[model samples]
Target chain A: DIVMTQSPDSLAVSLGERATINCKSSQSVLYSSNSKNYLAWYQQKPGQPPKLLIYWASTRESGVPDRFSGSGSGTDFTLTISSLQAEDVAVYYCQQYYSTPYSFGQGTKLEIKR
Target chain B: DIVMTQSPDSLAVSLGERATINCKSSQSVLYSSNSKNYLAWYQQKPGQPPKLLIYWASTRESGVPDRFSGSGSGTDFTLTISSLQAEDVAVYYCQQYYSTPYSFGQGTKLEIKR
Candidate 1:
């Protein structure tokens, strides 16, 4: 079983600034068969369910703004927001889908720096 | 993109009573090749990230209580708590992973009935 850990626990970034969240998994999530990271990213706002942002490590889900992007591989991954917007205030999480019993990171809360 | 819709935005059940949540997808998620439904379920407690509970539509994640079960196929599904417990209070979400841009249901909030 793999465990996921996220960094910072929270973050504060000014509008138009970059925000990044890190995620680490206990073991590599890269599939040897196809060499694809089995990782995904999600964002959640208060009172709403999480929305998928990226899958397979860096593929943004359709309709998600271009500002939201994902990168990294194996056991380490990153979700980056190029330009934070007021509507971007939310918690971000990373998940591994490489194996059964998928697991998720603790989450990083992003807030607009006052 | 497949759309997921869950029934009963909120539910309150007494301790030891059964609780059921329903999820419907816009289209079939059944993969005929393996007879597997590309669906997963998660539980999110207040102020925490969502936790994967069941996948493949009915396979419970390891360490998850057997009291929690999943059923159904193709596009319609259900997540059931055989007996409600205080620790079970949370929001439940269903997801479809049959294709790219996987989507999740709005969620069903489960609470303990007074």
Candidate 2:
């Protein structure tokens, strides 16, 4: 089983400030033939199911705000929220669909520094 | 994007009793070439990341108890806990990997009934 490790388990960011979360996979999630990273990002607000924000490493999902972006490849990935908002206060997770038993990061909790 | 919907937003089951959750996709998730349903299930507890419990619709993940089983295909599916346990209280989500922007169900919360 591949392990996904996320950094800064919890962080506080001021409104309009940038918030970044990092994730590292135990192995490369990039498929050599396609040159596409299998990483994805999700956001889960309290009492709600997770919502997919990005996929294919950096492709934002439809309706996802442009402020949210995904980057990096292979074993390392990042999810950056360009401008934080109160509604963005939630837990973020990185997932890899490169293989069966798709795994997810421990999750990063983002809070508004009020 | 396929919208996943889960029925019975919340349910209460007595210990050792059967608990069932239903999920439906906006479209078929069955792949004709592979004869596999690209649907998966996850369990999430408070303050914890979602855990992959079943993949390929019916295949249980490693170490997942057999009591937790999944069935169905195409646009409908089900997750059944044959014998609910105390520790089984949590939110369950169904996700579809058959297309881009993998989407998850609204989630079904399961509680233990005294």
Candidate 3:
């Protein structure tokens, strides 16, 4: 099973500041067949199921905020929130669909910096 | 992009009982090219990791309980917990794997009420 690790288990960003979360996969998630990384990002707000934000590396999901963006390739990737909003408070996770028993990142907690 | 929805927003049952979660996708998840239902189910416990329980719509992941079963076709799917166990308390989510972003259901939270 591949393990996903996220840096800074938690982060405090001002309402208008940019927030960034990083994720690393234990192995290469890039597939040569299609030359695409089967990586995805999800956001879970309190008391709600996770919502997909981006997948196939950087394609944003429909209805997701423009402020949310994703980038990177292979084993390393990043999810960035531009000018965070109060509604952005949630836990973020990265997942690899390159294989079964798909693994997810440890998760990053986003909070408003006082 | 497709929308996924789960029925029974919340469920309360006793351990050793049975539970079921239903997922409906706006679009057919069957990939005619591959003949696979692009659907998956996951369990998220409070303050813990979201674990993959079922994939490809009906295939159980290794280590998952045999009592936990999934069955469906096309846009309709079901996750059944036969003889529900104590450890099954969590929010269950269904995700469509056919499209980018892999849209997920609103989720169904299960709890032990008795």
TM-score of chain A of 2: 0.97
- Chain A TM-score of each model, in the order shown? 0.96, 0.97, 0.97
Q: State the C-alpha lDDT per candidate.
A: 0.91, 0.92, 0.89
**TM-score (all chains, Cα) for each model:** 0.95, 0.97, 0.93
> Measured by TM-score, how close is model 3 to the native structure?
0.93
**Candidate 2 clash pair list:** none
lDDT of 1: 0.91
Give one digit per residue, the lDDT tens place, for model 1 in A41-101. Answer: 9898999978889999999887899998899989999888999999899999898877777
Candidate 1 local lDDT, residue A74: 91
Question: Candidate 1: where are CA atoms >4 Å away?
Answer: none
Please write out the lDDT profile of model 1 over residues B1-114, one tens digit for every residue. Answer: 789999999999999999999999999999998999999999999988778899999999888998999999888899999999989999999999788777889999999888
Evaluate model 2 with DockQ and give the value. 0.91
lDDT of 2 by residue, A1-114 (tens): 678999999999899999999999999999999999999999999988788899899999888999999999889999999999888999999999998779989999999886
What are the per-model DockQ values?
0.85, 0.91, 0.68
Sort the predicted structures by lDDT, highest score first: 2, 1, 3
Per-residue lDDT value at A20 in model 1: 89
